[model samples]
Target: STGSATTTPIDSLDDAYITPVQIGTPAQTLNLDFDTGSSDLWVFSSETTASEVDGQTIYTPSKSTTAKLLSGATWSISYGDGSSSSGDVYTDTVSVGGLTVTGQAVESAKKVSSSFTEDSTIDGLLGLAFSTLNTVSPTQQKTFFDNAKASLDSPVFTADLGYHAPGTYNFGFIDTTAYTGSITYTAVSTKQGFWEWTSTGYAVGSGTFKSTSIDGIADTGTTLLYLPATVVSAYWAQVSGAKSSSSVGGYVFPCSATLPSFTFGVGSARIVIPGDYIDFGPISTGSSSCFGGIQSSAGIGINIFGDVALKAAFVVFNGATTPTLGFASK
Candidate 1:
């Protein structure tokens, strides 16, 4: 109710690269995970022969009179982790809050792992983050953003994912109150399709800017925020008594303390990551540590600014011509 809704297509969403949308009947909808790294909407079908997981929901075509399968054409998805599954395609009418998009395509996997198939109890993943990275072919692909643009207030979307509570993952609006003044603007690149940019450097509070520069990509699908070693260590430098613990792959600090605020500027638009984002304790991990909302990405494959960063602003990806990122106050 407090944030504004922004619509971002699969080609341009950066905040919570992973978005959730209704995938079944518009009336009794199923939530699917949206990813930019891949452009496929894989959901658990009611036809899954295996038993469902503990909190997982089901989408039985038998339950919905409107569900339709795509000619029994079997499909399978191979993950970077080497996991895979076989399934078929299905079409149904769906909605996100009030926006309704009908005849959307979804992958109904017959075989899935516990992590994806079993653990989350999720029926499928609705990947809207990117199409090029998708394992599936573009000719046959269509994401939520590609289908739902006509139903939104604006053809832009924002992910408010910085909330420490249960309600942080939000899409479609920019919260202007989070800013101190008018938002600075960044001209989108004619190059990449993601919310990507080159960062000159980083600084914490009054700390001097570090010489290290890191490339930044705002991704909502990724669950964590990863940064370069220099930036990660430098960020932890200001956490009073924050200590690094390699066991969990990050610094650990007490949750009771206040966290410092940081800023990321891209051309003209400067995004201020609020204090709540910095205080990364009281985490699901339970152990208290100097959690500065950012961790070292030195060993990780890439610098991914995940959902935590996107929850603060509305992010728009313009793919009509040259790809560009546009932001507005939620």
Candidate 2:
């Protein structure tokens, strides 16, 4: 009825978070990127082109008796970062955190981009976003959470991301112990098939809270925080020697700069992001200019409350018929 799983940052930069999932009759396990920004549970597979397969684990459909092709069904997806994959679809026994779904759609990759092939840390991605974002053709399949929600105590899931520390995800029930103070509920806009919500405003460190509505998505797949150019500029202005560098990309400052914390309002709750978290390591191998974790969303159609923001609080994606988002201090 309920389940929990430990998710860890795949790198020191908190580039992405990953969780283990078991698939098929024999329950072949693989570490998958737990992405809330996208939909489509796809994996590197035996069907993948040999040259395209680096050292990542593959799901072999022929090896699982429960694996049955969703005949004529195909899925393809391309991310904004340029990574893409395409594959045939199969329904098999898929399990995450101790919860099992007997006929979960598992897209087996026949082809993948070079970025995926080179990065073996993630065998695939388990997308937790809305099923409407799924790329399946002929028949769009439901997300794992969507398929199992009816059997859960509540149609909800929570995300507690960490820096280079402890992190976890929960399904069906909110772990009250995971948060402190009180959980603040906020209205969500699901029209775009995203966990999009509006923030009351923002503050730079101990500054006054600017009362403005910031429409953004709580995207777990994205690594940095992206806000309107004005907001981003405001944050960077607090630090000396900070500039948007074309050579290094985004806002970069001296690694020695004493940066200020970032605060954002979730309903009445004010979540604060530590300054050290903003000092995203060196821009290049031999550079002292460190990129700011928060960047301008000018080119990005919408602001993004990515891992940089998600790591600061407990997040609930309440998938009720009328969806809502919950944020609480932890």
TM-score top scorer? 2
Assess each prediction's global lDDT (C-alpha) against the native: 0.56, 0.91
| Backbone clash count for every predicted candidate, in the order shown | 44, 0
- What does candidate 2's lDDT look like per residue over 1-330, in tens digits? 988889988778888888889999898888888888889999999999999999988899999999999999999999867899999999999988888888999999999999999987888999888999999999999999999899889999999998788598898999989999898999988888899999999999899999999999999988899999999999999999999997766999998898999999998889999998787888987788888999998887999999999999999999999999999988
lDDT of 2: 0.91
Where does candidate 1 have its weakest 10-residue lDDT segment? 9-18
Model 1 lDDT on a 0 to 1 scale: 0.56
The CA root-mean-square deviation of candidate 1, after full C-alpha superposition on the true structure, stands at 5.5
> What digit string (tens of lDDT, one per residue) describes model 1 on residues 1-330?
112322332222222222345556435555555454456777676656465434556666656666777664556676433555556777777666556667776667677765665445244666655454444332365676667655554454444443543233333444455434454445443234455655555567666555445676766666556787777776667766777777655776677667666655555454556666655454455655544567776755667666555555555554433445654444
In candidate 2, residue 41 scores what lDDT? 96
Best by lDDT: 2
**Alpha carbon lDDT at 34, candidate 1:** 49
